[PDB]
Amino acid sequence: QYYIDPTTGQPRKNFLLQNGNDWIYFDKDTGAGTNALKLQFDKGTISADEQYRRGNEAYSYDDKSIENVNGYLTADTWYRPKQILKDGTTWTDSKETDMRPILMVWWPNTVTQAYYLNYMKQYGNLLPASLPSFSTDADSAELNHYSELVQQNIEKRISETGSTDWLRTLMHEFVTKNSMWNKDSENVDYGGLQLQGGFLKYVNSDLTKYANSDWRLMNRTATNIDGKNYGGAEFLLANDIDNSNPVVQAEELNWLYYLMNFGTITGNNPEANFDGIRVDAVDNVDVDLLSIARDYFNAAYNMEQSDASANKHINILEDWGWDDPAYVNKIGNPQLTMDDRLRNAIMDTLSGAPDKNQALNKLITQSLVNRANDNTENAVIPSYNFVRAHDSNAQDQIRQAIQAATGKPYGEFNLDDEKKGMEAYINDQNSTNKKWNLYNMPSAYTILLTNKDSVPRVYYGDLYQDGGQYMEHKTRYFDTITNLLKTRVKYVAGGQTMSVDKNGILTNVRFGKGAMNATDTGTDETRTEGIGVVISNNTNLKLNDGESVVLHMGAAHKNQKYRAVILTTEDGVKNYTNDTDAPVAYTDANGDLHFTNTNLDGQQYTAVRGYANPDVTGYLAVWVPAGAADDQDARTAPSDEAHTTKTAYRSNAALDSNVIYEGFSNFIYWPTTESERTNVRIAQNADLFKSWGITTFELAPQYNSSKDGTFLDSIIDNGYAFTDRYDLGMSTPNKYGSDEDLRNALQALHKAGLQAIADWVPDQIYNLPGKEAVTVTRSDDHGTTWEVSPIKNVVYITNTIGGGEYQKKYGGEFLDTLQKEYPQLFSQVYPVTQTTIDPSVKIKEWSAKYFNGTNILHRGAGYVLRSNDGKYYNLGTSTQQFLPSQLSVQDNEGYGFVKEGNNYHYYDENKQMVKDAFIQDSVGNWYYLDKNGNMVANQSPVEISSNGASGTYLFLNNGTSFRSGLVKTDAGTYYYDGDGRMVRNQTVSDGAMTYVLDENGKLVSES
């Protein structure tokens, strides 16, 4: 049962021997002999082709074996295969860490497969650089051979690097070059409020049921409560919160309570709570939120009881829609509407270039208030007005200056870029011809701060340079505007008149406290109060000799000395902060002040004429009575008299006595030292703000920025773009300081008698790190289906799960207290939902079910993998378990080596019988299927063309092709080479053995 050559001691291995009628086969490994005629084909044999198919199957359909999102697969999915083609050569059982890209073994179509091969060649170096591009007409057999070659090469590179890090990067780079897997399939469009290039609305589906909602009532703003009109755009930025969901509404109330009691809650400090809110993005949320905030404020503070009660909590609305004020008034002015008519009148008549400004008359009429003869109180819709805001004529133009100074694309910049753009923006601000800054700021602010029936709001960036550390540099308008502010405190009160003369010149008068009309004789304090303003926007203004400008100061101001507050000069303006050295003018017996093209009593700059300089383009002069005491204060305290209408604010002298300060710019820099922190500096300057008559300080939103760079707000970290609603400089400081700095700023403000406004931002949340599979539809800013998009009811990977530790800690945590103290909040029925809020679920973590939609995420319409007929692959978590065929186990019945009658056959991948072909098995044996498809296993030399020319083969009874071995017969000994072909007429070596074969193949000698 062993065969040795007794003369050499050496054993014969892989040796077929005839002994009489018996044949003995001595095996390859040990030379152990068996009856050759009883060798049987191994029924469990599989081909090398089948071994390859199976190696690449998924190890299992576990979450652990196949990267997924809610069970769905993506173009980025890696998986654990059953086996790894280790080092490109050796199939080896996979470890749990042997993840491989699905795109190594699967492609959505042959085109993408072809493109994959070209990419892996060109950028991966995973095929020879010489090889020709595979084209659209490329053959499947050819694609598969080179796909297998890429795998072999990938495996080789993994073996040498010991890593797949490189392959993660390479594969993702390839993925993003496919339209179906990048922004190109997402219909990028910036129309309307698609600020980030488009939206996907979330829709109900059986495929993503955990993301369903019964709400998502969109665009239900002041003009669209019943949903039967168009309304404002629901979608604006990032992850849109569904504020029509009663559970979300209760969480919005919870958050509002957190802000209003922030000091108590986070610092056990009753001096560090906010006093009012700004409602951000009013026209982009369910208007129910306005009544919800109302009702909370009513219950906590009795807002509607009196002016004294309402005015202790000044609230504002970011409500741009021109129909909003009528509605806000109807619901009780719980938060002050803006007057966007009036701000636009300033834009059209003062703020434009000399060739743009329109007739000044618009200032009188285009407003919630007609100001020709404003001689009454509590008669109009109360409102705030402003000339600029952090995002109104600031952020676009400042980005334009940065683009100009650096040449980088619009809205892209680092800190150095910003500084360089800021230098260009300030130089422009200091020019007569401005490209990026508004014109006539002193005149615009003069209108802002001398208007009756208005709460003016002063913008930080008109006092201090927008970019810089907080309050680091002043604008050219700082002296002008603060002079206006102190002057407003001291003198501005009573009735108002405005008119425009035949020369287009505006006269604006306030009579002083105690006088409503030009004919009122006034009270004690009227005399040295009031103000007279002359404005032109005509840089070429020239009065003809004899023509005049008359300010009708009124019957309280007959035969009276006036002095200038502001006069225009050739190069700028002159400010007078008190009577000293201020030019004077006297009213006549009627109370009229007269100006002409001639100076008054030799006083330079007292003639009316046009100028053009960096301050004034046109004309500005401002006059007040001389001889006011230094402590004169023309403000009115709010009455505690019961209201007789359902309203918080009323437009009257007490409300008018308020000034809001928007105390930030988007372009405040991150502090380099603790002393540079915005909130530190606010705390130190509370008495200064007070001295300007600021009664409420609007702080920036205090939420830590998501820092994700996806919009300006998360580039310059203003606090409008955040993951964690309750994290106010708490996990780490915000741009303005730590939460302790915020609390100290609130306390300092309160010590000075100022209120503080919390910026309430219910519209959206950014940068949620948890992926989620959600059925979506590409849509416009109103959630109208984007008709040309293929993304309609398509599963898409969103970033919707998370919200930070403070949302977790505080989410829904004050609802108990609110229900206990103010049960009436929980029975109110809101007009859009037509139901109450729902405190029964606390939101501690966000997910898709709580959102209306998302900006487009550039993952591509087909990022979530589907079969040809549109069926989604899935582990079975959210829909039917279904995997690509290459990942799945196959039914092996009638495939591979099949016995039929007395013969074995081989059926290929198409269940087709294989004829006249060699097939190798998984352990390296070769078999041959003859021209009738029958395996040859007859142990006799047979002629076969493997292609040219004909060779002599021998197949043992198990079907294996005999190779690299001797066959000793009674008629002679023959040698078959490494290809299983009989050797004739040469000398060969096989290991230590040298064989000489004659022309018939008979062994002549060995050694």
Ligand SMILES: OC[C@H]1O[C@H](O[C@H]2[C@H](O)[C@@H](O)[C@@H](O)O[C@@H]2CO)[C@H](O)[C@@H](O)[C@@H]1O
């Ligand atoms: O004409 C309908 C018009 O209305 C809305 O736009 C408003 C927006 O809601 C306001 O906040 C503000 O910007 O004024 C706009 C004009 O009223 C829709 O959002 C818009 O698509 C639509 O054109």
Ligand SMILES: OC[C@H]1O[C@H](O[C@H]2[C@H](O)[C@@H](O)[C@@H](O)O[C@@H]2CO)[C@H](O)[C@@H](O)[C@@H]1O
């Ligand atoms: O901030 C959300 C707000 O943005 C848009 O409003 C513009 C407005 O159209 C302009 O007049 C400009 O001066 O400033 C605003 C803020 O950028 C939307 O139109 C509005 O509906 C939305 O609430």
Ligand SMILES: OC[C@H]1O[C@H](O[C@H]2[C@H](O)[C@@H](O)[C@@H](O)O[C@@H]2CO)[C@H](O)[C@@H](O)[C@@H]1O
């Ligand atoms: O608010 C006083 C103002 O009212 C009228 O103008 C309104 C007009 O009634 C409205 O339809 C609205 O859309 O805008 C106008 C103001 O911009 C008077 O015509 C006007 O003289 C008066 O100042």
Ligand SMILES: OC[C@H]1O[C@H](O[C@H]2[C@H](O)[C@@H](O)[C@@H](O)O[C@@H]2CO)[C@H](O)[C@@H](O)[C@@H]1O
């Ligand atoms: O065909 C391009 C098309 O795109 C946008 O139109 C949207 C539209 O805004 C939607 O409300 C809805 O009807 O689907 C359309 C896309 O199929 C652009 O607004 C439009 O100008 C343009 O024609």
Ligand SMILES: [Ca+2]
């Ligand atoms: Ca919204």
